[PDB]
Structure formats: structure tokens, C-alpha cells
Ligand binder design. Sequence first.
Ligand SMILES: CC[C@H](CO)Nc1nc(NCc2ccc3ccccc3c2)c2ncn(C(C)C)c2n1
Lengths: 248, 326, 826
Amino acid sequence: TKPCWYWDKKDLAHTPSQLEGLDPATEARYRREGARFIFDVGTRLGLHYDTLATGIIYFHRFYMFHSFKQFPRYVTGACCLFLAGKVEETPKKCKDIIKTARSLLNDVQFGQFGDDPKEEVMVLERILLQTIKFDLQVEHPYQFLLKYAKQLKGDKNKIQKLVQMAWTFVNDSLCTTLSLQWEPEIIAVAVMYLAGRLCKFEIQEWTSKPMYRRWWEQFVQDVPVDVLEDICHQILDLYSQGKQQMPH
Amino acid sequence: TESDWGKRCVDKFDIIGIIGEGTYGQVYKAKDKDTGELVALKKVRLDNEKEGFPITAIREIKILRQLIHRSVVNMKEIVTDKQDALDFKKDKGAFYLVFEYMDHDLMGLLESGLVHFSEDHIKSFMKQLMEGLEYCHKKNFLHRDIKCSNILLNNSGQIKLADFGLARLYNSEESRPYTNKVITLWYRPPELLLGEERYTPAIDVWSCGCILGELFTKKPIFQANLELAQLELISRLCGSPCPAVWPDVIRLPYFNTMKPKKQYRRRLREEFSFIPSAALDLLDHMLTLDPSKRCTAEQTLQSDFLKDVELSKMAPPDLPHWQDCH
Amino acid sequence: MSYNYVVTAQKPTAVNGCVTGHFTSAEDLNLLIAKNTRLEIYVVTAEGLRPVKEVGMYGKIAVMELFRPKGESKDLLFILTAKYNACILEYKQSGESIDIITRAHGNVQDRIGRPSETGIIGIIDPECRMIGLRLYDGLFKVIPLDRDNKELKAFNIRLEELHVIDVKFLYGCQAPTICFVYQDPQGRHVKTYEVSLREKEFNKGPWKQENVEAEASMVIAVPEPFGGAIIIGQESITYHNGDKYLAIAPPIIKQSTIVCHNRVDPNGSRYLLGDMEGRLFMLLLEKEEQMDGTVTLKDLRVELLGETSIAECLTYLDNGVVFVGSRLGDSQLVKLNVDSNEQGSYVVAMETFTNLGPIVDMCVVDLERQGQGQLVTCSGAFKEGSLRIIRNGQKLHIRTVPLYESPRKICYQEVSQCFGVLSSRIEVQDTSGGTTALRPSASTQALSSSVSSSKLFSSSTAPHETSFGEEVEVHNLLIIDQHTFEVLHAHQFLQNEYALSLVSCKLGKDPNTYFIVGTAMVYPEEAEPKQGRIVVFQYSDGKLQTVAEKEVKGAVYSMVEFNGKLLASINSTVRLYEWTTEKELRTECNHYNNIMALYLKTKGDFILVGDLMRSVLLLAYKPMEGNFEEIARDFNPNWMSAVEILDDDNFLGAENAFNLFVCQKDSAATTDEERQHLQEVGLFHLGEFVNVFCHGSLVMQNLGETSTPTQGSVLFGTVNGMIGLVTSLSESWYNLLLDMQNRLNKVIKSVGKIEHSFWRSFHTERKTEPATGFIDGDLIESFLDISRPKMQEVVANLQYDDGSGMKREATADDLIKVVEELTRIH
Ligand SMILES: CC[C@H](CO)Nc1nc(NCc2ccc3ccccc3c2)c2ncn(C(C)C)c2n1
């Protein structure tokens, strides 16, 4: 019926990129750069946050089946965003994505697009569609962050602070392989959980079950804290590796 | 696995013939060589490459893999032409959307004049269509091209909706700009004739009501060539749009522009007096001018006409297959 | 685009309706006969009929009735066409000049309505106060006959009874009263309502509803003295008037359904009844006078008079002369005698009027080697079945060959100097367990005879029960001599086997010429036949030999010889068979994307397939591969009645809506999709049902110039006996004739003021399109009949094109020559 789109962390040691001699740090870097390229290009074009995320999810899934050494990442990214726009009904012309990609990329980086940028992108759409197995519908943590937050009642300002901080964590998680490890529902919980710790909030008080200390179980069944902590650790790792700090 | 779409080749289907001409490619009848199942193949050609894979096909793939109902057509898989070996750039082969084969389309049965619907036949037909539309509406999808051609009928009497190339999600919370010219003029709601641009799911209900009346007359109800003439025909039957019956008509772009010849009174019950009472009440509610007063798909299924219809008793249309020669 | 021309070679001959009245003068007795689109006016004499006038109407005549409103000296005529064109007509004569006046006219079509099963019914009040029309289920339309209603404006009254069988205005009622038989789930009932022009609704009628026979078919309005109505069924005749109810159920009428009725005595004492087997009855109203001075209906009696042609309409005229208006056989004048003849009959035929009847099939054959061609038709039905030999000589000369059974298909076999004809006759289950024929016929009067002994379906084990009295069809292949038309041989097919298709041809390397028949096993239980045969016969030395049989899983609706191979259509499948050196059929290739392959035509390696609902598909045989390929399909949906190939690119079809269309290959080969789309370039409303299309012409072409603007010749036969011809034009010639039509339509006065453009518009219950690609040759040929002032008015400002001269003005005398050349092809 439907394909399985989730791998174990341990499985990422065996992507085509890894097996062609790319080390884990380099592939992680390529994923961040490609995702952020997608994010930045589409933001300049005024695209909805779901459209950006969908392109990024296509991008991440693509490089579970292909190597970064044989598919230049910024061409793939542009193609993913191009298809994402049509899937999410926020369409853009391929020439406009190229125009924006050229504005944001230096001369070396835009070299990936070769002599005919539009052609390199349009040609890839065939491989992208076959790679993602024509499973175009994608759900993102954003809708669950809001669906679950709507069921919290209490101080308007503390919950809004929780949501925005969690929302930022969602945007930052698109640069990682969490999209490939955990369903979006879990991601939304993990970011609510992380924002709660950083804000010293006790979310259970805002739920309909204020004495149920594992507040998330009423939103996402069968999620151990271990999973939420692993997600939290990976998100904060991005901040620690960079110069950026938690939004708070 | 069954889910790894886009890889299996079209070699696996013996192509019987070309059933129809599509929007993004022609539609073919075929038989799976392995199972003997008759299937319908929609050819998607991305070789035009003006803007890549057609969005019309993307919508149908995206939505129909989500929708599972007896009255919604099933996309079984997507198959490809023999691909160029290790030359993805030169590969211009097309993709095929595999659908379940449907014996007939409503337009064909009606236009040939080869079918007669009794009240019981219409009950079974409308219940399946409106249940299917409700499934789509509960999932917040708008068909936007409901026409006799898109309704597909198997000889058993099972009805399935088909062409979702114009379908888009509807948000009640967030009103969104939509395309004004969506449905064929004959089945187009009055709100869209005046250019709503932010339309409700009630657009599909209007179209199904036009079909309901047609099943009792064997002739479409509102046949016009131009948008103004269409508003005139609707007005002659349903009454002219006016704040008395549609308070927000004054907000619509073309209300003052597209005035009908007169401010007509509603005669729907008079001209359709030959229709059974339960149906006439259903038609009167479905063909309501104001989309916020027009009934829903669910409300049609909780009507005296369709509520007690047992779907087990399929009741097929009366289609002659012999003595039609002479 | 394509350009084509259609002319009538023989006008419709079947009688659709007949009325008697005082239409031409208040003094004469007239008989108005309505053949499809044609009105014939006669005056009754002591010997027969004197013709006085004939007009054509731009519409099929559906209702034809004569009424005389107070203040008129003579009867007026109401005609309603099948496209709902209504009009009131008056006869006016000025010395030698006869013309028809349109007194009132309009179109009474409703935007919303369901056309009724029993068709359009039109009736007029005895006081001529209103015209009643039953056009749609659940509605009764009233045209009030006031002096001011020159546009025939009308209103609808809601009618609770949705399924009406028949309705007639009743005599002897205080106010306008309708009597109608209707059907609801509880059976059939007779009910009366009153019609109020002032209130524009029904009021309760004079007498109560009564349940009537389940197959109650016709309503008779009995004039005063009796009043009330008589209801004719399958088994019984009943009289209803208030409290009085009578019923006679004589066993003689149960045998055959009664379809027509006419009044003999104005007082209502005697009526004529006719049935489907051609019998003519007298229905007698036996009067009883009470001491009050009132006359009551005492009893009803039915008396068999004799036999006529299977009659659609009956008209008593005067004296003993009855006009038998027939649609399935020749019409007649017959005289009813008081004394029976020595055989027991009171009916003796006077005159016989040729009716080509339903033309089921036909072929063109040069019987005398004249380089001309003769048209041999399968005409008529049941006891009226016949073959008709038709040749040009200025009138058509027609020989009739009676068969007394229904002819189905005909094909000519020159090698054998004979015709092969498929026929069916009706037998009835009898007390022996077998069946008995109602009369001897061609298949039983053959010189030599044979019966299939095929064992193909003999395994049966499928039960089909028989009840005494039920009808069955018995199918035969007749071998008929081309000179004497003697039935030399008759081959009877299996029980319940229908013969559907017939060809005469040689196959493969076999030098023998065979008759090949495609059949279907027809059982009442089946929605669609699932068994059938292709049978190869050889006619040699006065005997028909079964050469080979091929079993198929369906009905062989159509067959045609294809380059030494046999092309046959079995249900959806289109199959090509080869004829082996072992004299057996072997399948080469099949095509399956069809709903039902009713019709097949070929040209070269190209095949045209006509589907029940999917219009026409152009297929090609690809010899390199040994299979078929779909060239293009007409994706517009049409119900086909016949098909024909005009040339390699243009294809002709006939729709069950009495419409004609031509499809062409798109010839804009930039995309595969465009090539596979056959585009309907020509649309035309013929007004006739085309059963058969045949290439050929009946004009004498040998040792002749035989030069005409027109190219090609397709003849076609129709249900109403009409024979027409379709021929091709150049773009230049089309434009000239089309521009001329538009000029002629402004000049020529139409009966009923019906717009010609409307009449020829492609019309189904769901669509109406303007005609395209077709020139109405019958309009063009009328230029020669309009007066000189009108001719010169037509040619004013008319220019020719693409000729030697780019623009060339036309004169009246120039066009007279052109049209006369066009009259030479028909
Ligand atoms: C989408 C446009 C088409 C044509 O109107 N619609 C369409 N028609 C289907 N079958 C009816 C049909 C129509 C035409 C025929 C012609 C010849 C022989 C058989 C024919 C059968 C069908 N089956 C399955 N699909 C899927 C694609 C949903 C279909 N889509």
C-alpha cells in the first residue's frame, strides 16, 4: 500500500554517500546546506512554510537512495522545491527558482547547475518522482504543534512563548535527519517538550489531565521519553556546534 | 513491494484501445498480463517540459492515494515507458496512472439515449455519488469538475467519481483565493458565475443537483454557451439572485454587472412537478442560490429520498444490450 | 472540413397517419395522408381518390387533426412536428392556384420535461375550444383555440398520473372532459378530468376511476347518443360511461393485438378495429331505447370482416371504401361488402399503393448488364415482407416479390445467378410441443429445403420452458433466382438461432464462391447472446451444402469480405479469419475495445466499426505484423444505426435520432492525440432512420457523359421507405450551393412557417446543433419550382468563387442549368 519512510540512526552509516567515501560529518554538512538552500530560496520567493518543509523532506529522502557525489545538492534542492510547489499548490516557475538560486549562490556553487540550469533541474524531476515513489503527501510537525497547543489552556503568554520556541525548533530540525527517523507527530511533541524544559514550564498543568505527568501520551501514544530526549539532544547539538544559542 | 511506484514498466499491460482523450494525456483500456485485470491507463507526458510534470496529474496522484471509498476511483499504481538505460537526461518516456476500468460513463449512457432510470435506480445512483462526495468533503477536498462525464458507472450499478484533476483542499478557518472558472458551465454554481473566487464545498453540491434533475429528464437543466445566458437560465428556474434570498450577493464581483432580464420568482417546484416529492425537495435544497443555505452532502444522505436506500440492493440502470440492433 | 450533398431519390412511402374531413371545401370529402415530412391531400370519389395537392413540411408530422371552429366554413388542420413545431393550416384555392395558409404557429417545447413513453398525443375538443397535448410525463398542455392566439401560446396543468397510455376528449359532456388510461404500480385505470380554461387547472370529472385490463391500449370517444368511451385491450373491449359498464372478451381478438380504430357510423353504432396480423374487425354498438326516450348501450359485438395489410391507420371514407394506411406493407383501398364471398370474407381489395416498407437491407446489382444498376431491397415485415427491384425509367419502376415473411439481409452471388436472403417467420407454440406457422411463406414454399443438423450447442442442459400460444422466430437462408425470383432453396437454422449477417464471397485460395451466414443463439433469459455460429454454405446444383461451421462466443452482428479473409464482429470483438486449405476458418487477429460491434465496413486495409453507443472507430489491418491498429475514434457519443466509408479520410454515420454525420481524420499530424481524434465535420438532420448504406447509383451511366459537380454515390434505405443519396462536393461548389440555400430560405415560404435552418439542425433530446457540411439537395432542387420573380430575387448579388473567374455573377437562367444537372444524379 504505502512506503516506509523511516530509518534507524544506525542505518545512516550506510547511505550511498557514506559508501562512496563521504564521511559522516560531510554528509551532515551537505544535508544542512541543501536544506537551508531550499529554505532560503523559497523564503525569498514568498513560499508557505509547508512548501519549504515538503521540498526539504523530498531532499532528505532523495539522498537515502543516491550519493551526493553523483547528484549535486543544490540542483536536487531546487528540483525538490520546484516539485514541492506543485504538490502543495504554491507553484513557481522553474526559471524563477533558478533566478533566486543564482542570487543566493556564489559562482562556484552555481557551477553545479552546469551550462543550462533550468534543464538540469527539470530533467531531475523524473528521478525525484521515482525516488520518492510518487508518495507526494507529507505531514509536518507544524500542524501537530498547533493541533496539540490548541488543547492547552492557561496563561496565554506562556503557551505562546512555548509555541514560538517550539516552532523555531521545528524549522531547525529540517536541517537534520530527524525527518527520516521519527514521524512528524513525535517531532512536534519533542519540540514542545524541549521548549518546556528551557522555559521551566510544566505542560501537564495546561492539559485536561493535569496530574498525568507524561502529558504527551494523550497526543502521541507509545512514545518513550528516550525518543523525545534523543530528538532534543540532536536539536540542541546543532546550536552547540554552531555559534547560535537557544532562542529563549 | 506494492508501494514502489514509478518503476514497473507498461510492458505489463496489453493495451486494448484508447477509451478517451484526457487533459494531460490520452486514456487507454488495458489488461494486466499477470492477473487479467482490465485497467485504465492515463498517459502523463512530461516531454512538453514547459513546466514539468503536470499539476493536474500531481493533484490526482496526491489526492487519490489518500481517498479510499467505494464511490471514489482507485489509482492502483504508476508505471513507465521503457526508460533509457543510464541516460536520465535523454529519457523522455511517459508515465501512466493505472486506474480500475469502468464499463461506462454517465454522459455516454445518457447521450446515446440507451438508459432509463426509475426512481429506485436514481436513489441507488445518487446515494453512492453523494456518499463519495461526503467522503471527499469530510476530508476537506473539493472536486470542482463534477460533470456527467466524470461520474463513472459499472454495469453492476456501482458509481465511482473519477477526474480529480482540479481538486484542492478547502479550509473553513483560512479563506483562500481560488480559480473562478472551475466547473463546466452547464454544472457551474451561480456563486462562481458571479466570480466568488473564495468558494465553498457547496459548489460540488450544485453540480450534483443539476445531475439529479437531469436523471429525471434525461436532459441537462441549464444548457448555455455563455456565462450570462447561464445565469439567465438558472434565474428563470431558481429565481434571480437578490439580497432577499442571498444576503451576501452584493459582495460578489459581478452581481451588479450580470443582471438577468427580470427579477424572476422561483418556479423550481412548478417546472419539476413531475418529479417525486422526496426528490423535488432534495432538488430544491441542492439548487439553492445562496451557498451558505445550500444543503451539504451529509444533509442529502439524511433526506427522505436517500436515507432509507439500502445500498446492498444495488439496482443497476436499465441498459439494453440486445434488440437495440433492430 | 468536409462538403457533402444529400438528395431524396424516393420520398417516404409508409403511412404515418390519415384523417377524413372537409378541408379543401366545406362541400368535398377529403382524405389527408401523412407520410414522414409529407402531407398528401385527396378528394373522395365513387371510384377512388382524386389527388389535389401535396406539400412538404420541415418536420416529421406527429399530430395531424382536422377541426372546424364556430365561424369557419370548412375544416382547419393542426399539425405538430416531432420537434414541437405547431401550426394551424388552411386550404385556399384561386382558380388554378392552390396554396396552403399558415393561420397560427409556434414552438411548444418546454425547457423542462420528460418525454413520454407512448409518445406525443394530440386531441381536440368536440366544441373546438382547445387543443390538448400530452408531450411530457406528469403534464397536460392546453392551447386554447381563441381567435387571438395566433402564436399558439399555451399553459401546462399539473397531472398527478405520470404514466398515461392514451387520452381523448370525450363527447357528450357539459364542459371539456378528458378520458385517459394510465398506469401506476396497482395496474391500469381509466379516469376522467374536466379542463377549465378560466381557472387553468383540472376539476373533478364526470365518472369515477375504474380499473381496466393490464394491457389497455386505446381510448375511443363514443359520440352521442351513447357518450362515454370504449377501451380496447389485448383480451377485452370495455365500455365505460358513469354507472354503466360493459365488457366483451371474444376469443378471436386475443390472438392478435389490436392497434388501430376508426369510426364508421357518425352516431357511433359501428367502429373498425385492426390487428397486427392484418385482420379487420367490425365493432358494433347494439342500441336499446328505454321508454324515457333515451338510448342506452345494450351490448357490444365483434365481427370478423376479413384481411387487409397490417395497418397503422384506418379511415372509413364513404360507402364501403376503407383506406388501409400501412407502415409495414402496401397501403390499400378496400371495399366492405354486405354479402360475404365464397371464402367467408367481406373485404375485397380495390387498389394497392406501393410502400417500400421498412428497408432492412439492400444491394445494388446490374441484373441486365446495362451498366446502370438495380436496387434490390429487403422491404416490409411479417405477412407484408417482400423484395423490391427498383430501377430508373420520369418515375421509378418497381417490381414486388412477395415473401409473406420478414426479410432481414440480402446479398448477390453472380456466379450462381441468384440472391441469398435471410428471413424470419413467426410460428406459435402448439399443442404438439412444437410450433405451427400462421401462414405459408417463402421459407416453406421453397423448391428444395434443408435444416441445420449442427451439434455445436446440442449439449444444452440449459432449460427453456415453452407455453402454448407464445411466438417464436424461425430463421432461414433463402436462395432466390435473379430472373424469376423463385425461391429455389430454403435452409432453416437451429431452434432459437437468429441469422444476423450474410456475405457472398471467395476466400483464400479456394475457387468456390460461398454464402456465409453469421448467427446468434437467442434465449429470452439472456441480456446479450453468448453463443453463435459462422456457417459456410455452398449453393451448387440446386442444393445448399454446409461446408464448414465455426463456433463463436457471441452474436455475429456483421461480416464483410476482407482481402480474401473473413472479417466478422462478435459482440465487442472484431475478428479477422483466414480460410485454410482444409476449408476451415482460422483466427488471425482480434480487436476488443468496443462496447458492441454492430456494423462493419472496409476499404483497402482500413476497417470502419460502428458501435452501439461509442459512434465510429477507424481500424487498420497491418499485414507486416498480422494484427489490427486503432487509427482514430469519434469520441463524441452517438447511437449508430448504419455506417459507410465515403473515401480514405471521410466517414459517414447515421444516428438513432434520425441524424447524419461525417467524421474525418484530423490530418494535422503534429501529435498522436490529434491523429487519433476523428472530428465530426458534417452534421445533418435527415428525418429518417437509415438502416442500410450502399455504394452505387441507379442512373443509366453506360455510353453517357455522366459528368456532374458531385463526386461519389452512396444510396441509403430507411424505415419509412425513403431512399436517399449522399455525394461529395468541392469547396467551391459547396459554398455556391450553401450561399444559395440561405438565399432560397428567405424567398421560399414554409408550411407552418418553420425555419429551414431549425429543421436540419442536428437534434437529440440532449443537443441541438446547426447543420454543417451538408447541402439540402431537396432545397436546391426546389429552385426549379419557384416562380420567375423569386428566381431572380434569389440570384441577386450572388458571386461564384475559385472558378476560372474569381468573382462571377449568377443569373436566373445560369442557376436553372446548374440545378438541372444536379437533378440528373437522383
Ligand atoms: C477520463 C476520460 C474518460 C472518457 O470519458 N473517462 C473514463 N472512462 C472510463 N470508462 C468508460 C468508457 C469511455 C469511453 C469508451 C470508449 C470505447 C470503449 C469503452 C469506453 C469506456 C474509465 N474507466 C476508468 N477510468 C479512469 C481513467 C478513471 C475511466 N475514465
